[PDB]
Amino acid sequence: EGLVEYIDAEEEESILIAMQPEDLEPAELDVDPAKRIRVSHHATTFTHCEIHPSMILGVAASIIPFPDHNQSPRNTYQSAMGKQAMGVFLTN
Amino acid sequence: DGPTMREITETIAEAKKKVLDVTKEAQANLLTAKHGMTLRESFEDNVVRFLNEARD
Amino acid sequence: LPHFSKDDYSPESKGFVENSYLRGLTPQEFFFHAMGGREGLIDTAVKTAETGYIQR
Amino acid sequence: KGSRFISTLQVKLYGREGSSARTIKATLPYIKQDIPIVIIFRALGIIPDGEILEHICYDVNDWQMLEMLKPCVEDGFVIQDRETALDFIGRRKEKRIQYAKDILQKEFLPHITQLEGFESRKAFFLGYMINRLLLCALDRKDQDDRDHFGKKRLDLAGPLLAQLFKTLFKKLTKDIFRYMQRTVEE
Amino acid sequence: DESAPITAEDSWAVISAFFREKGLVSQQLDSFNQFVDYTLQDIICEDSTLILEQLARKYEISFGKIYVTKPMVNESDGVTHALYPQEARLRNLTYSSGLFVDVKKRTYESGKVFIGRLPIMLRSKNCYLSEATESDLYKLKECP
Amino acid sequence: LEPGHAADQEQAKLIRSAIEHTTLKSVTIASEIYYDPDPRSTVIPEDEEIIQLHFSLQSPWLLRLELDRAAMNDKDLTMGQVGERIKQTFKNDLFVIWSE
Amino acid sequence: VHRNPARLMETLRTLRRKGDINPEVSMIRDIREKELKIFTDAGRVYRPL
Amino acid sequence: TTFRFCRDCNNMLYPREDKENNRLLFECRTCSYVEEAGSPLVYRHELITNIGETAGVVQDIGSDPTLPRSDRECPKCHSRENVFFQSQQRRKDTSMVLFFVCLSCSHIFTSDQKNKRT
DNA sequence: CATGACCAGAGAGAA
DNA sequence: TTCTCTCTGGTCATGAGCCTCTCGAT
RNA sequence: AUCGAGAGG
Ligand SMILES: [Zn+2]
Ligand SMILES: [Zn+2]
Numbered sequence: 001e002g003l004v005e006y007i008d009a010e011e012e013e014s015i016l017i018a019m020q021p022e023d024l025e026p027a028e029l030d031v032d033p034a035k036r037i038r039v040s041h042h043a044t045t046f047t048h049c050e051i052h053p054s055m056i057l058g059v060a061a062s063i064i065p066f067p068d069h070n071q072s073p074r075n076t077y078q079s080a081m082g083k084q085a086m087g088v089f090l091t092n
Numbered sequence: 093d094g095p096t097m098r099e100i101t102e103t104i105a106e107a108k109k110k111v112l113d114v115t116k117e118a119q120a121n122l123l124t125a126k127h128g129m130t131l132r133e134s135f136e137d138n139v140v141r142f143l144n145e146a147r148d
Numbered sequence: 149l150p151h152f153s154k155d156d157y158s159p160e161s162k163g164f165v166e167n168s169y170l171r172g173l174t175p176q177e178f179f180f181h182a183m184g185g186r187e188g189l190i191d192t193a194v195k196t197a198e199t200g201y202i203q204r
Numbered sequence: 205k206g207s208r209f210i211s212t213l214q215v216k217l218y219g220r221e222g223s224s225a226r227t228i229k230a231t232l233p234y235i236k237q238d239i240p241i242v243i244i245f246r247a248l249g250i251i252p253d254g255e256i257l258e259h260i261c262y263d264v265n266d267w268q269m270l271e272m273l274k275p276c277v278e279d280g281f282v283i284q285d286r287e288t289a290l291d292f293i294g295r296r297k298e299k300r301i302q303y304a305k306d307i308l309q310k311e312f313l314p315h316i317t318q319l320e321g322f323e324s325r326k327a328f329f330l331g332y333m334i335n336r337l338l339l340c341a342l343d344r345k346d347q348d349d350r351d352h353f354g355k356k357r358l359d360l361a362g363p364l365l366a367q368l369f370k371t372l373f374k375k376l377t378k379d380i381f382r383y384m385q386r387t388v389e390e
Numbered sequence: 391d392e393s394a395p396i397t398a399e400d401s402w403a404v405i406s407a408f409f410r411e412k413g414l415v416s417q418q419l420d421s422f423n424q425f426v427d428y429t430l431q432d433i434i435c436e437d438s439t440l441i442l443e444q445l446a447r448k449y450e451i452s453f454g455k456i457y458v459t460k461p462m463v464n465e466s467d468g469v470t471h472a473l474y475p476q477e478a479r480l481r482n483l484t485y486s487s488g489l490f491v492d493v494k495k496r497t498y499e500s501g502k503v504f505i506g507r508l509p510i511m512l513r514s515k516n517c518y519l520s521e522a523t524e525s526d527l528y529k530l531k532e533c534p
Numbered sequence: 535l536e537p538g539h540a541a542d543q544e545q546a547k548l549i550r551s552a553i554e555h556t557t558l559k560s561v562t563i564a565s566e567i568y569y570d571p572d573p574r575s576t577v578i579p580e581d582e583e584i585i586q587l588h589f590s591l592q593s594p595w596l597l598r599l600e601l602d603r604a605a606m607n608d609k610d611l612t613m614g615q616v617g618e619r620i621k622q623t624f625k626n627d628l629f630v631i632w633s634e
Numbered sequence: 635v636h637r638n639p640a641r642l643m644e645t646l647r648t649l650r651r652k653g654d655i656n657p658e659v660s661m662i663r664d665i666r667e668k669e670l671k672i673f674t675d676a677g678r679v680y681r682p683l
Numbered sequence: 684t685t686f687r688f689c690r691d692c693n694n695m696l697y698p699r700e701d702k703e704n705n706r707l708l709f710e711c712r713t714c715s716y717v718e719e720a721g722s723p724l725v726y727r728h729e730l731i732t733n734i735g736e737t738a739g740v741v742q743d744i745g746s747d748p749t750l751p752r753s754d755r756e757c758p759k760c761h762s763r764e765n766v767f768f769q770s771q772q773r774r775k776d777t778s779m780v781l782f783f784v785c786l787s788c789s790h791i792f793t794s795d796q797k798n799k800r801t
Numbered sequence: 802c803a804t805g806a807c808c809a810g811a812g813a814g815a816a
Numbered sequence: 817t818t819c820t821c822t823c824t825g826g827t828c829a830t831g832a833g834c835c836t837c838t839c840g841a842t
Numbered sequence: 843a844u845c846g847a848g849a850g851g
Contacts, residue, residue, distance in 0.1 A: 010354030072185030200833025666739030
């Protein structure tokens with residue numbers, strides 16, 4: 001139904017992706033101090049939107065809790081180590 | 093505390109506007125061609141200097 | 149990144165994390181920070197062998 | 205599709221950035237020396253200097269690129285018909301021309317086509333390669349980034365098995381042929 | 391209501407869909423399925439035929455359509471029978487099916503033939519598990 | 535620096551200029567070859583002032599170079615110095631005049 | 635060569651999204667260099683959006 | 684510079700000096716064609732170049748989503764619909780001036796204040 | 802991978 | 817003409833952290 | 843043994 005599209009790296013040269021659908025909301029102050037700081041997009045001619053930014057990660061780092069709060073080599077380290085953790089690898 | 097983080101983010105803002113000014117000045121062909129470096133080099137040096145100053 | 153317009157020499161466009169680890173990095177800050185951390189890891193991984201050979 | 209052999213065509217711009225007599229030559233798969241581009245072009249049937257430049261330069265108002273091309277027009281001024289262009293070829297006489305004719309459609313730009321009679325497509329494509337070469341040499345386009353992911357390919361299970369299967373299936377085929385020859389009468 | 395724009399929460403709905411349809415190894419299965427369905431035949435037909443000549447005639451042998459079975463095993467002093475994964479693991483067997491090609495021999499102016507066994511990627515289309523149920527799998531000693 | 539001539543930037547800048555290598559290519563904008571066959575009257579209107587002030591006391595092909603104001607300011611370089619160095623290179627094997 | 639590439643590009647994209655062009659085929663219109671590149675390759679990494 | 688080719692051969696012409704009348708002619712060297720020169724300029728060699736700083740302006744440019752939009756008005760028509768970009772020259776000492784393209788009248792203007800060329 | 806000496810060539814001065 | 821002189825691309829060629837483990841085909 | 847692969851500080 002043409003609501004979603006496959007883009008490869010060559011093709012993403014010609015596009016402009018939003019990060020969250022909220023980027024498409026119009027604007028025209030009073031903010032939570034504790035939240036992180038997001039620069040306004042200052043771009044309007046969007047053609048696509050990310051499904052979800054967290055989808056940039058692999059299977060391993062998708063286990064890391066709050067990886068947006070740690071220095072990146074630690075995320076690489078945990079990615080290497082979680083493959084060394086024990087658990088039920090198969091129910092059979 | 094909230095006062096200190098207010099000051100921290102106002103500092104980040106002032107650095108952002110410093111670099112905005114640097115860039116508009118570069119875009120008007122109004123940089124000084126100080127000896128030994130391109131205009132773009134002077135610009136990059138100034139912006140990186142500003143942002144590192146902000147972080148510190 | 150394809151989320152930026154062309155010719156954008158902004159702080160945030162070219163890899164300035166204005167957020168702290170406490171508050172949290174945005175996706176673009178996350179990816180740029182990852183870009184830097186990888187360079188760190190590779191510098192580690194080969195400096196090790198180069199200094200081993202130097203010491204030898 | 206077919207034998208996935210890889211040919212490599214180089215178009216080299218001779219001469220340092222401050223040197224003059226800056227010529228362009230091409231490397232072709234079975235000839236020792238680089239041969240100048242206009243000689244290829246005329247061997248592909250594009251004889252006049254203007255037609256050649258039209259194949260390379262897609263704007264007549266680009267005097268810079270045409271000025272860069274002038275030394276190539278001077279380089280192959282000696283060769284001004286198609287047949288003599290085909291003759292200029294490094295072999296150990298008529299067979300020389302035939303070897304060149306074959307190479308041009310066989311090993312030169314094999315991905316365009318390997319069937320005969322499409323010298324025009326290969327001439328235009330060679331010109332396109334030359335155009336982007338000169339675009340880079342005029343500090344108009346930047347060096348090509350070899351680490352763009354889009355220019356990268358991931359051979360998965362399918363392709364790997366296919367590459368292995370082609371090799372061994374032809375070994376089985378050669379064995380079949382040898383058993384056939386051995387049995388001339390039984 | 392129905393046409394209102396989505397929010398960031400709604401994104402996960404789509405994500406769920408994406409995985410319901412593909413799982414987590416889609417690259418492997420799509421590559422192998424494409425190989426089996428199309429690429430195999432192509433390579434069988436590439437340069438296949440061979441011709442030998444004599445004084446009078448010429449004899450030609452040409453391979454045609456390929457057929458790939460479901461995984462089986464040939465038991466020494468025994469029948470060939472359907473090989474399922476767990477058996478192939480426990481018995482140090484190779485979970486692979488058979489290649490049969492329609493080869494003809496023409497002469498101037500044979501039926502299906504065996505040519506070998508291709509290892510099958512589990513959960514590909516020629517794998518028994520591709521159409522299996524959760525209960526089917528448990529009955530097959532295969533973790534779901 | 536020479537002992538005692540430290541802390542005067544101007545001496546230092548004079549050493550910088552004396553020491554940093556300079557080519558013609560550094561200051562040249564464009565290089566042209568014209569057909570200008572009557573020496574006393576050029577076909578380039580701009581140059582008439584030039585050929586006009588050559589009233590004191592070859593080959594019809596003209597080589598004409600244009601030089602960069604800013605590059606000439608970044609070095610302490612005169613049109614006279616450039617021209618004298620060209621004339622010294624070629625030993626009256628080539629006739630040189632220049633703008634002011 | 636193609637003149638009026640905007641029309642052709644709209645047609646191609648609507649075909650791919652309809653399904654009439656394989657959704658894994660990629661299509662890039664480089665406007666400022668007057669190029670259109672289509673890839674039906676095997677082995678290039680893509681992601682949904 | 685401009686360049687000229689013989690009308691019969693479509694081969695490029697070579698300059699010749701008519702020494703008698705001090706004329707500039709352009710000769711073909713595949714045949715005997717010759718013709719008057721239309722400019723005294725034979726060779727131009729730019730080292731500081733501006734050619735190709737505006738490269739890539741086509742009427743379709745306004746539909747490049749990749750390109751950013753300024754709030755400036757057109758000097759000609761005063762539409763505030765414009766695309767902009769830095770110089771397309773990939774020399775590393777290139778002025779960081781931004782060229783604007785009006786999306787209403789296809790007119791290129793510039794953020795430069797030190798010069799007003801073309 | 803990638804940084805680099807050895808000939809072997811050939812252009813190149815002197816008496 | 818001889819002779820000594822520079823004097824550079826195709827080469828072939830080197831190593832390339834230490835252990836340490838475990839595994840897995842021939 | 844040999845070749846290779848993964849991993850650890
Ligand atoms: Zn002619
Ligand atoms: Zn306008």
